[PDB]
Assembly symmetry: C2
């Protein structure tokens, strides 16, 4: 199923590109779902895609957080957050 | 916790930026593992990180492919592959 795998991945790549163009750096998870649907990602796959993007460091999305804000927020440009955190904690 | 999750993700973000700057567009999984180790990702974590990067569309990695070339190859700049494939097949 190499062809099917690649073509589905291509949609998430488009999602990554669109989050890059978007000037927002923090959006709601509902906002994120809408952008994912714009590039053709099916509803039943959005949760899985959000998890893959978080584990790959492409977004920060912390649905298990008890902080009400982080729980429903998607950070779409997390490189700045990673770099800032390692700077201020000197690690 | 949120902080450990973010700092773990930061390593995979660093891996993505190393792969972007590497002149090669196709590397062995062995070489991929080595670059990941350079940024602190252990061999114990590599399979999960590669799954997340593949599902995110950040790499193409088809280890179960029967084509002997693809099964050990990591495509580190797949954006051009996605574009070409959708173009030549007209969706």
């Amino acid at each position: 199923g190499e062809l099917k795998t690649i073509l589905g991945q291509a949609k998430v790549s488009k999602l990554q590109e669109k989050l890059k163009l978007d000037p927002r750096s923090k959006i709601t998870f509902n906002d994120f779902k809408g952008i994912a649907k714009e590039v053709g990602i099916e509803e039943k796959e959005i949760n899985s895609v959000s998890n893959a993007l978080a584990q790959s460091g492409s977004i920060i999305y912390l649905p298990n957080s008890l902080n009400e804000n982080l729980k429903t927020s998607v950070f779409t440009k997390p490189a700045h957050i990673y770099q800032s955190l390692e700077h201020i904690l000197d690690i």
